Amino acid sequence: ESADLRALAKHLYDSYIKSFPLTKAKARAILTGKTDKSPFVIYDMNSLMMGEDKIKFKHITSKEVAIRIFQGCQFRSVEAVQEITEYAKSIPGFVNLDLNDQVTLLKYGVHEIIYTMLASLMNKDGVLISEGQGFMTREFLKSLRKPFGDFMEPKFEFAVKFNALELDDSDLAIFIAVIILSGDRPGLLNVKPIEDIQDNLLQALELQLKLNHPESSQLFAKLLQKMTDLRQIVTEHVQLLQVIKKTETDMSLHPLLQEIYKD
Amino acid sequence: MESADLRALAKHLYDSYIKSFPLTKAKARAILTGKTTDKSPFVIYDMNSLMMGEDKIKFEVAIRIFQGCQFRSVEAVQEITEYAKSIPGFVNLDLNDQVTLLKYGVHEIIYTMLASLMNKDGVLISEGQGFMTREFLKSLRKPFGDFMEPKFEFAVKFNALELDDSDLAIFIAVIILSGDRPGLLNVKPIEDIQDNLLQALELQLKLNHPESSQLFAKLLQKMTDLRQIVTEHVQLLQVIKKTETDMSLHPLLQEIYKD
Ligand SMILES: O=C(O)c1ccc(-c2nn(C(=O)c3c(Cl)cccc3C(F)(F)F)c3ccc(Cl)cc23)cc1OCc1ccccc1
């Protein structure tokens, strides 16, 4: 079944490339400076104002900067959820699961996958925006006022550690599939076929990492250990959103917009 | 990194685990499953049978049981510390990192090893001479009842893997040698030791559970559930501290929980 796992790896890679707008391979070329197309840099309040007049960043509807950026992260996350939902359908076996378990697996997986894939857009100095056309500095995000500064920095701290593994897109395509097919999500009705699919994906990821990183000792194990850190930081993440809700009375969104963002 | 060396490391760790921990999973399972006259535990299921139990096993009620667990936890810390010293390379690490690895490792290991003493109905106590029912523990008053039950929820799931003692010996070693503990000074020599231990665990699980697909991955995923439950534990212990001044902690546990 060696050729079967490679077929599964290639299938997921092809789908991952079609599902997501900015791949890791492309994002790294932008971040490192390796075919022109130099991104607009947002490093302070003035260059943010000019950036939405030039890039027209899809986040301009509160007048306060820190809130507008925070809500920007929400808008992009809602888009990522739909992209991840579309990608999940290409995982062999997923659409044949009970419909409620599909919803459940997506509901509890999307946060871990967004964190994971956000690392692809990050280095220690900042993050790509607008499909790589802009670059927002870490220092500017970290220095946002009151809770917002400390809301952004944990994402960078995770990404820097996760990126030391040096996964590429063909590695990440299987890893993301493994996260989705987690048989311990609360409320699953039929755990057995989810775990059976995840076992196939784990075999595929194990073989992929040996062939693509033959010199990287116990990388498979190290990546599974990261699925630990993910459960933890997603939990911290949610407890940070709750504090913003109870503290900040300037989060006035139209009730309909609030409904779009409810998750 | 080569097979005979990985098998040699597995045998070393199992041999040392048997020397360090007096009540193995193999012994606990023989006691739990029964059909043996000689190894039958006295069963504590209510207040009256607890009273008779201290006359037989020589083992406020909720406090006395909590205090019972602390005493055994301190002994467990001692046993785990002794085992850690046998892990090749551990004592050669920077002394501050040895402390750090134990500080954050003992709790995850106690939980792991407590599963060996448990089934869905209760837990062995007093080196297997007693068995305290889950329902009795769960029904202890105020915060103490809900303090015991998460251990059982984990053990039922962990025990579904059907690991034996030779498996757990390497798994416990992998937990201790975690390079992501806060405050470590030299991550690299710890990660090199864990890499050998992970190679050793991977091969051990393939040879000992050849029909158990991706058991390695499933066991590493369990180190997730451990990290979470240790967190819930300390958050419950903190609430007990604010309510109960009629109890103190052993200085060893006290230092372990500081930060
Ligand atoms: O383009 C992308 O793929 C992209 C995806 C996510 C983010 C982003 N989310 N986020 C979350 O707090 C989050 C996560 Cl992690 C998970 C679930 C839900 C949320 C949220 F709460 F938002 F609903 C961030 C926090 C800090 C920074 Cl730095 C970026 C993000 C950004 C993306 O693209 C880069 C970007 C950066 C700023 C604004 C817009 C886009």
Ligand SMILES: O=C(O)c1ccc(-c2nn(C(=O)c3c(Cl)cccc3C(F)(F)F)c3ccc(Cl)cc23)cc1OCc1ccccc1
């Ligand atoms: O014999 C053993 O090896 C053994 C070890 C641990 C426990 C046990 N600890 N505990 C902790 O709340 C704990 C932990 Cl996990 C870690 C650190 C500190 C503490 C504490 F809070 F105490 F400071 C429990 C909670 C519920 C149950 Cl069910 C058992 C335990 C029991 C052991 O043996 C079985 C046993 C059970 C009751 C009494 C005596 C012995």
